[PDB]
């Protein structure tokens, strides 16, 4: 099982620098080159550079030459990408990827990605508000005023058992902060015929996990 695991989300101001790590396992780290490829939200994949994990040789895209540095720690099986003089157009998900040289070159394994957000604002954890309706009944959760856009929802009953999650909705940007909704659909007859008066919405965010009781009608 080849695996590439990257560091967590980053929030930076314009002009600052950022360093992302990529830990490799499941193969001989020194035998393969590691490339870095970024993707702005909703945009094209954009190659940035590669480093030979063995001898440390690098090559960078002329678009990033002079502001990007790729390094490797062989004993930690880790590659690093540092980007300085960050601008708002550097806001993107940055991926490390292994290059398979056998036959024709190709990127066979990718890291999960690291969201780097460049913002004049500051990182903040979300604030949660319940969404209560005024067949299945819809119950919901509104997370507001969080940054970066790196949030995940989960739901639990009063008895602490998991509620089957439903398709998450993309966050929206407003006043430099993000907002997102989540929903669960509960059978109506089991809600009205039940002693439970609420469920629990939970959010995970790099700056603070939150919980909120959501009433049931």
């Amino acid at each position: 099982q080849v695996q590439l695991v990257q560091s967590g989300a980053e929030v930076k101001k314009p002009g600052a620098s950022v360093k992302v790590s990529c830990k490799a396992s499941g193969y001989t780290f020194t035998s393969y080159a590691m490339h870095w490829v970024r993707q702005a939200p909703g945009q094209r994949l954009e190659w940035m550079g590669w480093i030979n994990a063995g001898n440390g040789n690098t090559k960078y895209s002329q678009k990033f030459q002079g502001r990007v540095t790729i390094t490797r720690d062989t004993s930690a099986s880790t590659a690093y990408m540092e980007l300085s003089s960050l601008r708002s157009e550097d806001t993107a998900v940055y991926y490390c990827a292994r290059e398979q040289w056998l036959d024709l070159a190709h990127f066979d394994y990718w890291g999960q990605g690291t969201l780097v957000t460049v913002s004049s604002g500051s990182a903040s954890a979300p604030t949660l508000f319940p969404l209560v309706s005024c067949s299945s009944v819809a119950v919901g959760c509104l997370a507001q005023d969080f940054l970066p856009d790196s949030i995940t929802f989960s739901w639990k009953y009063k008895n602490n058992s998991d509620i089957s999650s439903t398709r998450g909705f993309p966050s929206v940007l407003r006043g430099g902060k993000y907002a997102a909704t989540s929903q669960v659909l509960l059978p109506s007859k089991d809600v009205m015929q039940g002693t439970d008066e609420h469920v629990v919405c939970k959010v995970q965010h790099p700056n603070g996990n939150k919980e909120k009781n959501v009433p049931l009608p």
Partner: protein, 214 residues
């Protein structure tokens, strides 16, 4: 620099259909072409390398052919979980490692009308000074839908945002969340709050509403 142009840019197809996507290179790249799949919020995944070699672990319905300037990726029997963006990428002449602009593949299925729910702002939010009114559209196809916010039957504009889920991996439907943002004062100056939904699966628009009291 070698440019890669993918066709079509968007494509809808039915479960079981044979689907073909093309990538054209500005100059010959021999067999140095790779195909990747990317689902929303996830990293690219290698499907094909060297124009026609299937990556280990990839279902056999994915195949590729071509050499020189014209290449094709074929899905021989489309599955619901194949909804995604597909990229070609050349590794002959680098840098740059060129990627195509992507082909977005949606699953075509029968029309399904949304179920609509409206949620007023919570008191805890109202004391913050802002009021968010939410409207959810659940389990509809096709993706095209229209949400119109109305406050005392006055059509709103410029004060709402919305987002749409990915296509469901089993039933191929979408869900959509829309938020209308007012100030506490403006929110308390009006009574009836409604979202009206227009969609192909509805013979007439469907409206959900509440009154600020209840």
């Amino acid at each position: 620099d070698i440019q890669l142009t993918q066709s079509p840019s968007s494509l809808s197809a039915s479960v079981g259909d044979r689907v073909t996507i093309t990538c054209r290179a500005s100059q010959s790249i021999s067999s140095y072409l790779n195909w990747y799949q990317q689902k929303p919020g996830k990293a690219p995944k290698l499907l094909i390398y060297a124009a026609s070699s299937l990556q280990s672990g990839v279902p056999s319905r994915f195949s590729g052919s071509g050499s020189g300037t014209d290449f094709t990726l074929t899905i021989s029997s489309l599955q619901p979980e194949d909804f995604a963006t597909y990229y070609c990428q050349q590794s002959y002449s680098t840098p740059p490692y060129t990627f195509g602009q992507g082909t977005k593949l949606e699953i075509k299925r029968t029309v399904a009308a949304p179920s609509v729910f409206i949620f007023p702002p919570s008191d805890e939010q109202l004391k913050s000074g802002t009021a968010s009114v939410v409207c959810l559209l659940n389990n509809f196809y096709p993706r095209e839908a229209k949400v119109q916010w109305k406050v005392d039957n006055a059509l709103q504009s410029g004060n709402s945002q919305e987002s749409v889920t990915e296509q469901d991996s089993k039933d191929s439907t979408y869900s959509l969340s829309s938020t209308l943002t007012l100030s506490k004062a403006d929110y308390e100056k009006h009574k009836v709050y409604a979202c009206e939904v227009t969609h192909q699966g509805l013979s007439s628009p469907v409206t959900k509403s509440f009154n600020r009291g209840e």
